[PDB]
Amino acid sequence: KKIQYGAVASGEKQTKAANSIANLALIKTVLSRISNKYSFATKIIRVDGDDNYAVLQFNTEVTKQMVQDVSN
Amino acid sequence: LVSTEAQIQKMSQDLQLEALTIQSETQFLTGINSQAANDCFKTLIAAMLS
Amino acid sequence: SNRLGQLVDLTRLLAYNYETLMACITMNMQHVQTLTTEKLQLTSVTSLC
Amino acid sequence: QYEILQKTIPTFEPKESILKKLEDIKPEQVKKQTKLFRIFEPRQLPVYRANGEKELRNRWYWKLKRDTLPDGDYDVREYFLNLYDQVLTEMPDYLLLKDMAVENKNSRDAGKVVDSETAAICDAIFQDEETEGVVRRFIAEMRQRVQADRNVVNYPSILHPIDHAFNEYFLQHQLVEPLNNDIIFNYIPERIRNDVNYILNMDRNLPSTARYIRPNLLQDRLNLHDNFESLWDTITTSNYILARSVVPDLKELVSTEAQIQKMSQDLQLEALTIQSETQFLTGINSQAANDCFKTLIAAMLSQRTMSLDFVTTNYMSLISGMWLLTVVPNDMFIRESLVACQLAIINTIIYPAFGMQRMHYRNGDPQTPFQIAEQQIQNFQVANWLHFVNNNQFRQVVIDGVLNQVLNDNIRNGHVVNQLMEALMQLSRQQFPTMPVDYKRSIQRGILLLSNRLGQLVDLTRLLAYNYETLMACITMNMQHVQTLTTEKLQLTSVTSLCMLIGNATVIPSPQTLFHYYNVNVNFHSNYNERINDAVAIITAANRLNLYQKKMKSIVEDFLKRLQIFDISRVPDDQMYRLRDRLRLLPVEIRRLDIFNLILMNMEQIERASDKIAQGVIIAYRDMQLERDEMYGYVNIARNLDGFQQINLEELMRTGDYAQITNMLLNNQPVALVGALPFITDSSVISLVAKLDATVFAQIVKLRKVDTLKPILYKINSDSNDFYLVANYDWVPTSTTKVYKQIPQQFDFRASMHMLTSNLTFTVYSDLLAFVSADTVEPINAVAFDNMRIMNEL
Amino acid sequence: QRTMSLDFVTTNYMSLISGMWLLTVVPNDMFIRESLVACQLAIINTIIYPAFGMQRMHYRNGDPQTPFQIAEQQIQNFQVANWLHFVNNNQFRQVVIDGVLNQVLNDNIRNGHVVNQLMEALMQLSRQQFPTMPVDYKRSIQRGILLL
Amino acid sequence: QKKMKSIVEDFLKRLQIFDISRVPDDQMYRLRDRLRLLPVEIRRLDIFN
Amino acid sequence: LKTKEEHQKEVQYEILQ
RNA sequence: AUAUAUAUAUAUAUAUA
């Protein structure tokens, strides 16, 4: 069975040096679109393949609604 | 509108926030999308009419 | 400051879509300070300019 | 035994364009035309007498070739900008008539006419039995006149007078200048043919025929270094990588592969192992001497700003930085990184040597810490070197029409090293009173590895300022000194590999890679001023033709495209509409200005002499006699739009307020509509008596639209049916509305012959530095601007 | 009467010392002028003028004086300037014999005597110290002269 | 109606060293012009008269 | 470079030839 | 009769007619 699969190939030499590019350059974009509603100032964006975190520092104290409306 | 891929690459290479003296934070260019410029046109007229 | 010619042309538009929308206003346009404020982000103003 | 399971991947085409370096930009392929520029063509039409009856003979008339005129008065001006872009690509650089000259089929002696079309015309008149005799006798004595001593010819033509003024302008205004031996040597710049080391030679001498097309090498009328800091960054990173290609490799590094085999088979015989006479240091290689020689020359010739990269804990990289700031002027090193290197020499090498307190240098002080330590220091020899570094500047002089920034005269000599090593010796004989003794021994061991190299460092300064001086003759565009955005990292641990690993072998740039650096700075600079003038001639012709609706981002989008080094889609509308305000203020080049006036003077004679478009209809609501013509018979035509109030249908569609016309069309006022209407022909006469021509305008009142207007142009003649009403009854035909339309001109054959002239033979040559074959004098004795040689140190 | 462009490399001075013999026997209007000049300038600028210590010869191309005609005036030795008066003035002398015209040489080359004039000019470049040249390159360019 | 070039085309052909096609058209009209100002030979003229 | 200019010679010498 | 990609740290082992 020959299945067409044009996506990324986990198993190249490239599979970790370009999972840290393609995931940093993705989350640098999705952190730009949520700044139309909440104005913040991001501090670090650490990325490890898929698994990444990105600390956001706000103006006010973080409440139970800014956590819910960023996760949404 | 002006395309977002054009204005950001002129704004992130004239500002050059990555090569600044401060490295305590990751600095990049935020909120230059085509949804906030379309939203500041709605807010700045409707909060002025009413 | 280099974007001047396309920014003279925005406030000519921002004060024309205000100018002819205000003609469809029958209620009195009284101006006082309201309690709850509609929040505007300056990161959304640096996108319109 | 397989089975294929394939799915739909969504297509994604990102906005991009190809970018070439300056090394491979193809020069402009020269245009020579094949046939004449024809826009009018003679045509055979029936003729009708004053009665209206058809005559036995026929008549010839000038009509357009492919008369496709769009309707509405704005679309006509959009056609004539499109015609103006059609004459420019057909305009030839050199035009010979021996390539386009076909035989006349019948003449007195068998001569040639100038085109295949104008021979097809002159044989159409000969076999036409209805033609006159004296027209046929004129085709017989229609031959060429050839003169060999001045090599010009005179071929006849049959051209329209609008067509003739476009072809006569192509012949007298050509871009060919004569070429011989004494003008090939003027193509080489003055600082190379008046140089001792290069000896210029050529084999063949060119005849008294051969011509060449000179490039318009005038400086950039756009000031793309002024306020354009994103376009000047990419027009100097495209010049820095070209200049890096032509800077030659050092002779201590490079040799061929077989010479390693040629030096390995005799190494055990001739024991020469410490001939190189250097003390080794960790971090010293020859691949960084060859690198720092190229990023010091090619960052000066393109005016990039270098950025120093170093570590503070290397006491030798800071000593080798003292040579760097005293040769390269400090305006090139970037201020945030010149200062952190200029302060590190002060707080480590200079101020502990005198025992002074290390300076409190706050961030962003306006005085650089060499300009604040020539006042605070009290020596004389290390306060004389700190005065040269504080006032080492480029000297903007204009040479051969090209402003380029020569170095100071002491740097080309080498005397700056004798100012540094005179100062680097007094600083080594100091006591270092505050610091311990091993810190004194750590500098005095390292400052003496550089004072032992005075003969090899007074000569690196000669060679570095001669390779920069020689290669700078090959530029053509105006080098301006403006700090660029992105910087070029020069590692200061790679100047140390340059300062103490060179020796006794001049590397002089060979003349085959000077002629290549000059033929790609002409092929880009002539591909610059032929894209300015191609994009100014459309911007000025858009405003002159009154195109208020054309967004002129597009004809600056392709100006930045044809310069092959810019990416368009990452240059926004901000940096393409500021550029329109600069290209508008420029004067359009004389070949394009003299040919736009040849369209603008008669853009009303091309528009009026064509069918399927009529320039407005007039309405009268009264019977008036329609005038008799010979190509139409009886036609409701009006040659002048006089006596009637006019409505501009370009404006009636623009503003769209129809309240003027629909209040003037119900009350039956005489109105002359003005525009460009498609007219239909109603050749029947019983449609004229039934007054069909008045019933077409009432669709402007019920329906607002005015583009669906078709005025009626009658034609009453003998071939029309029911014609006997005009014959029997003594009446002249009367219409209500007549069309403002112009009569086509007659094809008078003896008045339309034109004697086009051009030369007999050219041999147009592409580049001229293929002929002159240069060679360099032996680099042991190679002469600087002083008549003493370089690499003179033993 | 076919003209004759020269071809040489400026580094190889031994093909340039024999370039002195070519000019003094073959007439100087035989060569195409932009290569005759670059051959006489290549002899002066690296053999003749460094032999006497004087500075290098900056030469505009569009100059009606052939570069030996300048150095014949400006050199001070007589053994090597009286040879530069021969290279500047051995052109073809037109004579008409038996009804036809033929470019005939002079009687100072047809008997071979002018080579004796060169060998007093060429030998004195071998005695002159080249007062800035390195010693291993002066003796390799003085012994190369004594091969001719 | 006689192309005088064609008399000079095979004049350069009988002279075995030139070929016909590579001569420029500048010089086949000088060679046509320099060939008319000459007089004819006495034995080719007396047989023409 | 050497082959590109030696081809540039024989296209420019051949217009003369 | 015999299938286990790539990168990052860390540890263990090994080099010889």
Automatic annotation (TrEMBL), chain A:
- Membership in a protein family: Belongs to the reoviridae RNA-directed RNA polymerase family.
Cell compartment(s), UniProt: Virion
- Residues binding UTP are T15, N19
Domain of life here?
Answer: Viruses
Which protein are we looking at?
RNA-directed RNA polymerase
Placed within the complete protein, the shown segment runs: 582 to 653 of 1088
Q: Which species is this UniProt entry from? A: Rotavirus A
Q: What does this protein do?
A: RNA-directed RNA polymerase that is involved in both transcription and genome replication. Together with VP3 capping enzyme, forms an enzyme complex positioned near the channels situated at each of the five-fold vertices of the core. Following infection, the outermost layer of the virus is lost, leaving a double-layered particle (DLP) made up of the core and VP6 shell. VP1 then catalyzes the transcription of fully conservative plus-strand genomic RNAs that are extruded through the DLP's channels into the cytoplasm where they function as mRNAs for translation of viral proteins.
User: What is annotated about its quaternary structure and interactions?
Assistant: Interacts with VP3. Interacts with VP2; this interaction activates VP1. Interacts with NSP5; this interaction is probably necessary for the formation of functional virus factories. Interacts with NSP2; this interaction is weak.
TrEMBL record, chain B:
Q: Which gene encodes it?
A: VP2
Q: Tell me the compartments it is located in.
A: Virion
What interactions and quaternary structure are annotated? Homodecamer; each decamer is made up of two conformers of VP2, called VP2A and VP2B. Interacts with a VP1-VP3 complex. Interacts with the intermediate capsid protein VP6. Interacts with NSP5. Interacts (via N-terminus) with NSP2.
Q: What high-level taxonomic lineage is stated for the organism?
A: Viruses, Riboviria, Orthornavirae, Duplornaviricota, Resentoviricetes
PTM description: Sumoylated with SUMO1 and SUMO2. Sumoylation of viral proteins seems to have a positive role on viral replication.
Q: What is known of its domains?
A: The N-terminus binds RNA. It is necessary for encapsidation of VP1 and VP3. The N-termini of 10 VP2 molecules form a cylindrical hub underneath each 5-fold axis of the inner capsid.
Q: Where is the signal peptide?
A: none
Lineage top rank: taxon:
Viruses
Question: Hey, which family's this protein in?
Answer: Belongs to the rotavirus VP2 family.
Name of the protein in question: Inner capsid protein VP2
Q: What does this protein do?
A: Inner capsid protein that self-assembles to form an icosahedral capsid with a T=2 symmetry, which consists of 120 copies of VP2, with channels at each of its five-fold vertices. This capsid constitutes the innermost concentric layer of the viral mature particle. It encapsidates the polymerase VP1, the capping enzyme VP3 and the genomic dsRNA, thereby defining the core.
Complete-protein stretch covered? 346 to 395 of 887
